[PDB]
Design a protein around this ligand. Sequence first.
Ligand SMILES: CCCCC/C=C/C/C=C\CCCCCCCC(=O)O[C@H](COC(=O)CCCCCCCCCCCCCCC)COP(=O)([O-])OCC[N+](C)(C)C
Lengths: 164, 216, 276, 114, 76, 64, 89, 469
Amino acid sequence: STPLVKTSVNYSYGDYPLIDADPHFKRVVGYMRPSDYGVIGLATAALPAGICFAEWLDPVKGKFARPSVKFLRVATMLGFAVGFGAAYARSSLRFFGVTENAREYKKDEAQMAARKAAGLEPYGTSSLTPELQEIAAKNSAHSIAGLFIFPWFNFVNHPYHGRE
Amino acid sequence: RLRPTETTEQVLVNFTKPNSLETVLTKCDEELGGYSTVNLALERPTTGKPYGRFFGNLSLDLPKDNKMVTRSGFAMFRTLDQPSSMFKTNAWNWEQYRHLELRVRGDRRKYFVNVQSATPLASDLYQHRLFIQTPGEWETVVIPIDDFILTNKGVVQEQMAMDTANVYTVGIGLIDRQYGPYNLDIEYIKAVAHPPLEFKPKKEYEVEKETILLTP
Amino acid sequence: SERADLAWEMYGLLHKFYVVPFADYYKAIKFFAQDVKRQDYALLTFQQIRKNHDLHGQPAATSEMVAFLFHEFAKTKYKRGIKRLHEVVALETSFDVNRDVLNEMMAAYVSVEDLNRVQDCWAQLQQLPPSIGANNRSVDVLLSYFKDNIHYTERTWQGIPEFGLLPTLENYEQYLINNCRTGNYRRALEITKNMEIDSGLKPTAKIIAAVYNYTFTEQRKLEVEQWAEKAHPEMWLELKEGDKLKSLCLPANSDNDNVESLLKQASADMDEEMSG
Amino acid sequence: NTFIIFIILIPIVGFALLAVNILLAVYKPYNEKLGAFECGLTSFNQTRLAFNAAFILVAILFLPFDLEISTLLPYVMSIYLVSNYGFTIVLLFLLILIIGFVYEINTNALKINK
Amino acid sequence: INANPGFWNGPFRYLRWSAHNRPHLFFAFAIGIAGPVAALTLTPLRRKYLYPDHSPLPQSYPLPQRAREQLTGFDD
Amino acid sequence: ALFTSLVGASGLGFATKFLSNKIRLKPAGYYPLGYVFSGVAWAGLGLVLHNVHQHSLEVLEKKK
Amino acid sequence: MFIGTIILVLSFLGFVFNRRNIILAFICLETMLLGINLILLRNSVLFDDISGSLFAIVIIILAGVESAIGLSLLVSYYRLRGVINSYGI
Amino acid sequence: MLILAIISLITFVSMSKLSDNRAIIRLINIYLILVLVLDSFLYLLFLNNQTYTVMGELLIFNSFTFYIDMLIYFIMIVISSLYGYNLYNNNLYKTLFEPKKELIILFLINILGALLIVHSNDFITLFVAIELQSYSIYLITAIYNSSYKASKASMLYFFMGGILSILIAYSINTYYSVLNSYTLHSLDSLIINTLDLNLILIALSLGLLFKIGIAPLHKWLISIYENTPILITIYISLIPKISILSYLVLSNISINSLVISILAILTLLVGSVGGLLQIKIKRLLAFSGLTNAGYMMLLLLLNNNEFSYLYYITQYSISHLAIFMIIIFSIYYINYINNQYNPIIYVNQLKGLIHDNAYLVLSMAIVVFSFIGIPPLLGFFGKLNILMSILNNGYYFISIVLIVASLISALYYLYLLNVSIQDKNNILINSNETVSSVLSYILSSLIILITFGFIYNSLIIDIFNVYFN
Ligand SMILES: CCCCC/C=C/C/C=C\CCCCCCCC(=O)O[C@H](COC(=O)CCCCCCCCCCCCCCC)COP(=O)([O-])OCC[N+](C)(C)C
């Protein structure tokens, strides 16, 4: 769990304190606000609603025909996908100290306090060699900036989170 | 202004001129071992406009001087191959015509309008039959450009559109599988732009009426 | 219709085993098209005549089938068959194009809405002498293609006298439809009232019911049934129980949209109701 | 150095090709009996033949699928060194390729004459 | 005779239909999706119960993290 | 002002709806509910842009 | 590098002149890619660096995909499928 | 968000009928709309011009890349709306604008390639993204292969782009041979001063700029644009140009380049003068794009040009989409159709359009004036920013060439309006069919943006000053 290269300490990505430069996927989902789940449901209902509204505005074959259940289900799955991506990005920018993250900061503080009390490592221990840990951290560093393009999440318990 | 010239017509086979015949060549099955004959004349009589004459015989007998052939008996004429030496255009542009009009007296024979244009293959031909409606009298039969059917070796193929920006030659030929003499008198072939909708028979042919329009 | 596929196999054995008379081709083409549901076999039956004539030497197909088979294609809006059959016609060394083929070929293109091919076939019909050429069938298709253009419908009507023709009952009906579907309810009545004076062709039930059907004003629909009670009393009464009259009209608070846009939607719905 | 070799070699072989191509300027004007092809007659009576799209698709798609397979060779040579991270990357790579394989199966693009 | 009942209409009915009517595709998907899923749902179980993962193998010499100590012996 | 920005955005939405109606060869008062929808949507976009502008000015002022 | 650069030069000038010999032009594309790969591999060997070889294999895969796409284009262009669809629907 | 869309489209389109193409394209249209409106908050990552490196220094991420990314989604939404939504509900318009089964997948893969071009930080990533975009755009050009006019353009574009990509790879490998590196992070002021790697970057810029078709290699792409379907031409003539020009702007490898300046002047002159010799709409718009490309290439000669380039590319994208959509809408008002793929060819076919749809002609007049640069439209302001940037760096001859080119181009721009405001006595064969409400709304939104985007000039300037400095 010993880092191999030097990393920035308490770097400020915004106007809020840094919680985790490269938070884990389970970490990001666990630190998710109810508003983010509201966003997920909003998108999950919006794509089918968007399809229905587009059908109402301009029917495909002239006559108004509601889309078949297959299109509704595909739109529901894609809506859950886009909502989950937006929620993950919002939680990440909370971790990056860009938006308001006071409650997340307090939960993070209590969490590593409990972990240190239990006698564990701060960001986990891995199945990967330290070189692979560094490669994973360098690949997944700030990968949320490309949410428009590709999905990529940190599934490696690497120590390169930019904290003390 | 100084833009490329735009026009509603382009004469392909003009005839009606002292030279005329220098613009076209002929090909019968004498290129094969066949006995069909082709010959192009030039008639310039009075009380009318001078025309070309395309006659001959189309004996379908096989060439008993060789064996690799299977079917013979053609006779055609076409415009001279487009001279593209170093600097000129290269071919014809038919991107603003959509039609080709030709004025001709016909007979019982079944002629084909043969067009050669740019194509990846070599022997591809765009050909549409020349529907002679009135035999013995002149008719300005119009054939839409985007109705020619692509044929290679005489076989209908994947119908891809003609490359109207690059057209080489236009001609009339006989591939009719019947014996006997043939004749066809043409006096022009031109590609004509889109005509607006009309609701009269023609100015060249008319029927008795009240003649509402004021006489000149 | 369910067993239409089965008729195809039995047709094949009838020709492989027994020599089939050429006159039977007409019945099979009319059967495998105009009879139950299937039109793919109509083309293949026509293609069967072609293949035997080229290779085996069987007698060639006549232009009567292509004229008929275009008409059958212009009923199901079969875009694939029209393109297939056209290029077969364009390279035919046995039969030729005449008045009848162009008329039904033009009608085939109106069904698939081809503004170019429709004008192309009209140029070929037009450039022919009126002796053999533009007939009432030509006008019947030409008016039906200008169904929503009042300007070209009218100039088509003056076209009929120029070609040397007298309009027919089937010719008048589409003209009455075209005037009605473009909001000219009042002009339609004068045409129907004065048609018997001008031409001597007494209006029929398929004429009067057409005018009532395509008049989309509740008062203008009433003026249609004002002369009918006192000029055609007997022949109306058989339309009330036949359910021929249909009372489709325009909405109430519909002045938000164009009146001309309403007439398109009203007539489009009415076309389906008269299609069967 | 490569740029230098390129630039100086351009004129020499360029002039050589220029000269050897100004040669064909006039040659074999293919005056062969091209009369039956400018009309539309056929002399084969046979040799029709056919090629279903699926046949040429098998031939063409042998190449991308072979590239997909041969891309697995670098993985099997370093399987232990990149064990779990590389295992996940290869799983994603294979799933992406199987998306296209599913495309070619569902479309039934590769079924020869039925 | 046989018609597809649709996956979304019933999952288990469609599974049986695929196993009985389309063996090749059903088995292809079965073995294909078993791999990652069984890995995710069994690797922690194997680590917890069967045997822990082996210690990492060396890739080069293990360099001590210390200063040079003074040694005596085998001198010139 | 926020109110002025919202009014301008709503007016741009109304202009877009009017232009769409006139392009379709339809009367100006064709689908007034569409006018309402277009105005609401464009006003919302204007509100978002105004909020972005306000945050931009706040960030500019904060580093002093 | 000599051999790669000269192959690239010869194939490039063969492409520029013909330009209408689609079979030979596409062959020249393949040979120019081969010539570039040779230069890249030689420089990777000289520098004892892995990036050159990695880019070489990437160019190989891209060249294969490009060749597949181009041969599909030639199939569509020359109508290799054939027709013999006469007397059919 | 794009990879998942690509995978889901392959899976869904595999198991769908041909008639579901419109519905699938609509679904992706709303999908991309929600991606923009719901994930737009990611712009908070780039306060004070903060920059990130992603995927092992293989990708770069900043406000410039984010803005080009969002613009590419907006353009993709508009173009995909042009495919999913039916302009007129009749069989003719059914036939002309019918999407292919794989067209949406190819579109998204080409968008992915363009974005990876914009976000590239390494020459390996740059080349891979270039090859992805190139193969996708070849397949886009060739997917309508029922005509020889389109087939010749597809084959020419394949071969010319193959030569260009080979030249790009050769330049990249020469750079690697010189420096044993594949990234620009090894280039500094000392590196440029000490060693002569300028020619390598000139060759790279040459190969990249020829892909979008600057002089003297403009004729092939102009022929391709002329011969491809117009719904394909609207896409193939905007997105690759945006990707290449954005990569060139962010790379910043052509400071005060004599070769780049001369080629930009040549591009401007050729585009302006050759436009005067055009009677076809497609060729005229191709030369218009050439002139705009020359204008944007003039911005490659100086630093701190982010605002001018961004403003000009956004306004040009909007105007390009608007002008092609106006040409598409005008198809209904002509008596005959040239081809199934290109239904309108000659500018003369638009003659008298003011008697069929006066407001369509008004919108076209607005977009043409914005192309010319008449205030207060967006085109004038983009050209003004270009002029300010070039005069700040002392390029006076370049400014004179720019002004002369604009004055010359105004002639063939007003050619369109003069033809369209004529009188056509030939009445239509079609009447009263209603045009699509969604596409009309999108066109009107584009026109209103062009007309009244100058309201937010100060707001955009402040946002740029706070997010790019
Ligand atoms: C509900 C979420 C929907 C958001 C989707 C946005 C898609 C953008 C797409 C296509 C471009 C259309 C015009 C965008 C305006 C520039 C925004 C900006 O301010 O430009 C700056 C950079 O200026 C520049 O360099 C030059 C920009 C050139 C603009 C040329 C067009 C002028 C006319 C447009 C005026 C807007 C009219 C709105 C009417 C209500 C980027 O700002 P930023 O990176 O800090 O983030 C912005 C925060 N955002 C992401 C929430 C929006």
